Structure formats: structure tokens, C-alpha cells
From Swiss-Prot:
Positions contributing to substrate binding: R83, L89, N256, T305, R306, R329
GO MF annotations in UniProt: heme binding; hydroperoxy icosatetraenoate dehydratase activity; iron ion binding; monooxygenase activity; oxidoreductase activity, acting on paired donors, with incorporation or reduction of molecular oxygen; prostaglandin-I synthase activity
Protein name: Prostacyclin synthase
Signal peptide, first to last residue: none
Major site of localization recorded for this protein: endoplasmic reticulum
Any one Gene Ontology BP term: prostaglandin biosynthetic process
EC number: 5.3.99.4, 4.2.1.152
Keyword annotations: Endoplasmic reticulum, Fatty acid biosynthesis, Fatty acid metabolism, Heme, Iron, Isomerase, Lipid biosynthesis, Lipid metabolism, Lyase, Membrane, Metal-binding, Prostaglandin biosynthesis, Prostaglandin metabolism, Transmembrane, Transmembrane helix
InterPro entries referenced in this protein's UniProt entry, alphabetically: Cyt_P450, Cyt_P450_CYP7A1-type, Cyt_P450_E_grp-IV, Cyt_P450_sf
Keyword Metal-binding: yes
Amino acid sequence: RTRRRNEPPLDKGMIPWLGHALEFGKDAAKFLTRMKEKHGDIFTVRAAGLYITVLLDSNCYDAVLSDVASLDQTSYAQVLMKRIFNMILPSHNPESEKKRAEMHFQGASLTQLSNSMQNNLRLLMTPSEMGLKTSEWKKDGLFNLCYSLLFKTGYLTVFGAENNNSAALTQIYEEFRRFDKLLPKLARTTVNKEEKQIASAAREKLWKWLTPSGLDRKPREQSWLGSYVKQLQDEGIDAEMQRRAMLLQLWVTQGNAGPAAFWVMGYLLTHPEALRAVREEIQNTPVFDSVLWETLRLTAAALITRDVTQDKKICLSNGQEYHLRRGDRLCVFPFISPQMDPQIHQQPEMFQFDRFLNADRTEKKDFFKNGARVKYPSVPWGTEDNLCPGRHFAVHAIKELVFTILTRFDVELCDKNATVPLVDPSRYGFGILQPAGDLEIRYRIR
Ligand code: HEM
């Protein structure tokens, strides 16, 4: 491989064919940040025989990705669902189900879903559910606690899975965590033999449990999940692959909200002034909105991937023209820019609770890089034409959990001086970051 005219800088690495595959996978943010410092806002890396052009000029993300004739999302999605979920969906219409997700998670459907979520969370934060039948205080990891509560809430709400009792929901959650922990390694083909066995064992249990085969529950074909299942059935997808698809939809709907709620609570518990303004506001939620947006800036790290299906000319904001080559991949990583970009957000590694608030506590919208307006200073839900359809529901759920914890419980750090844990670097690229260890807490009924 050799650079052609106006192609991005090329970085092959020293390992023939394999290139940067290992380093890229181990900590995508560290590697792509290193590459940005070396080459600038656009560069092409070799990884496992493939060439991946990375674009980090956030002013171009929307316009570049709008070219669906030159930039395919479907092929890499198929790769991931094979590797992670052991799934193949032949003759599958992807746009029809994405349209269903948009509609089902907005408007009157959203209000219904959100009302059910509120009800379900209440059932899950009972003293008995909260492990408070033995003692005044209960110790837990905050991440584990927030993930457990929202996973269970979202699962009950989205899958309508009341057939599962309390102990059953815990079993399902713990198996999901087992699988979820190994998901990045599955995506990257970096599982060892023991991990591969664990992931496969976990998937099989989840395939069985998420489809209650033994029961005669009449399908709700007008619901989000029921209409999805009905589509697969009409497309000729067999029962077994229908079972496997449930784990895909479980991960897509449950893999982010609880982790995000953890970071919100982590940042708040470790930032007294932030927590005071939030609690005061509980007594329109402008402060909490800034808190949540700041949390997502720091922790929403989905990587956007496309296959380049034809040669494409592109212009960065400075006017320089670059050529994308057919057969390559294009990646866009909003986590690095604009979210963690020090030229847009000063001290970007710092949680500043009011970073998106003006002096008079109005919404701060004015953000700049080197004397140029930045249209989207944070991109947690994805690029403008490919937004998370569940985002409004995600925010409702995160708010509901945070509101309940602060209102109905006393929550204390076990180590009064603790800061939030570091990030597990395997999570970069897959959505909300997860902590390396946990933040140990104690809680009691307030
Ligand atoms: C903070 C929490 C969440 C974040 C940050 C988030 C973010 C994202 C992002 C960035 C994507 C784009 C896919 C990609 O390029 O990898 C996506 C897709 C999607 N999200 Fe969310 N999400 C969250 C929670 C949720 C929730 C609670 C739901 C629904 C209950 C949901 C439903 C979906 C669906 C159905 C897709 C489309 C999957 C596909 O078409 O392949 N998400 N999400």
C-alpha cells in the first residue's frame, strides 16, 4: 500500500499486515489520540490487513456521513452481529425497523413507555429489592447498583417480561453482565479460550431465558419488540435466530443507560457543589440537564464505522481536500473531538457540572474551536442523521433513577475522599464507558 495524491497521512505500524490492530483495540481513545497528535484530524491506519481512515474534524462529520451511496453502515453491522451475537439475518430490511425504533421511542409511545418505566423502577426499589431487610445500611458498588436497577427496569419495560420474578431478573442481569463484559473482546476477536467458552455459555443461557418458549404469551405484534419479532418471522428467520436476536435488542436497549446513571451519581457524590445544586433543584431541570450532558461528554464513546464503497473526495474545515479510497473503512470518533477536545472544552478530563450553563443558569450554546462555531459541542447520541432512537427514553430513565436515589435514600461513599474510578479502556468504541473497578457505597432508606 502506498499513499495516492491527497490521501490522508498513512500509518502502517511495524507489524506486517496486522499493523495497529492490537493497540487500537486495547485502548481506542489512547491510540486515536496518539494518532491525532502525530498526523492531525485525518489519517489512515493499517489494522489486520485493512486500511481505516479516521476523521476527527467534527465540523465535517454530518456532511461526510450523509453520503450513504459512498459510505455503507450495513456490512460492518453484519460483521459485529456475527462476531458478538452469533447472528445472521438474510434478506433483512434494516431501514424499516430503524423507522419503527424512531416512532416507538417518541411521542405518545414514549409517554406510555416512560410511565411503565417509572412504575417498574418503583417495584425494583422496594426495601426488599434494595437488599434492606437485614440492616439499616446496605453496601454495594455504585456501578453495579445503577446498572442492576436500570437493566431490570428497561428489560421489564421494553420486553414486557413480567414472567420473570425478582430472583429470575437478578440471574438474567448477572448473565448479561458476564456477556457484556466480554463483548468488546468478541467484537475484536481478542477472547482467549476460557473467555470464549464463558461468552458462548452466557449467550446460550440468555437465548433460552429471553424467549419464554414454554409459555403461551400471545405476541404483542404492535409493541416495539413484538413488531420486530413479527418482521423476522415474515422475512423467513427461524425460531433459533429469533431467540438470538433478543440478546442483540437487549444489549442495544440496556447496555448504556445504567452505566450512564452510575457516572452521573459518581460525579455528583464526588462533587459537593454539583450535588447541592442538583438536590436544591429537586426541592424544567436546567442544572441536572447540564450535569447529565457533562457526564455524557465524558463517557459516551461510541465509534462510528463505515465501509467506503466508492472513492470519495472530502474537505476539512480549513479547506484541504482528502481522498477516501474504495475498500477502506471510515471511522468517526466524537469522543476525541469535540467531546474531549481541549480546544473546544477547557480541561476536558474534568467534570464541570455547569459546563453547559451560562452565568444566569440559561443553556450555554456558544462553543468555538480556533475562532469557529462548533454546531454540536458533544455528540453522545451519534451524528445528526443517525441518532440513538432511545435517547429521550434513556434520559427519562436516568433522571428517574437519580431523582429516586437522592430523594428516597441516603447514599454515602465508603471512602469519603474517593474520586470516580478510571475507565476500563476496552469500552472505548462501544457506547457508555464502564469503570475499571467500582465506587463502593452504602445506602439506607431515607
Ligand atoms: C446514555 C444512554 C444511551 C446512549 C449514549 C446511546 C447511544 C447510542 C448510539 C451512539 C447509537 C448509534 C449506534 C452506533 O453508531 O454504534 C445508538 C443506537 C441505538 N440505540 Fe441507543 N443509547 C443509549 C440508550 C438507549 C436506550 C435506553 C434505548 C432504548 C430503550 C436505545 C435504543 C437504541 C436503538 C434501538 C439503536 C439502533 C441500533 C441499530 O440500529 O443498530 N439506546 N444508541
